[PDB]
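Reviewers asked in the last cycle whether our approach scales beyond single polypeptides. To address this, we selected a multi-component target totalling 123 residues and predicted its structure end to end. The input consisted of the following lines:
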Amino acid sequence: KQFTKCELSQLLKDIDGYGGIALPELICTMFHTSGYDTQAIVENNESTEYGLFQISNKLWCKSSQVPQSRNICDISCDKFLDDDITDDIMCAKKILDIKGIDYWLAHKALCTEKLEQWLCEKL
Ligand SMILES: [Ca+2]
Ligand SMILES: [Zn+2]
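The resulting structure, written as structure tokens, was:
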């Protein structure tokens, strides 16, 4: 599933301000991270990132590729490739709590300025 800017904004409205993070900033971050695609899979060296939030099997979810993973979100990585982003959001919040917004390189690089374009009026 590939969401549009406003569709996703509506789904994450209740997350505004979570961990001091503003909604438009999070939308911008996700645009440059996965392009709003729930099925994005990106192989890094000996690890892989999954889904809309690009959650890593190196530390956050369990995958057969990295059997030694701490699996902090306590969930198999396949759950981040389906149509329900509810469990993806639960894990992203745990990343925000523990590690913070810098888990996503896009935030500091491109998402602290030129923010009006990320606002949504109605879809
Ligand atoms: Ca999911
Ligand atoms: Zn990444």
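The chain has one domain: 1-123. We regard this as preliminary and will revisit it once experimental data from Aim 1 are available.
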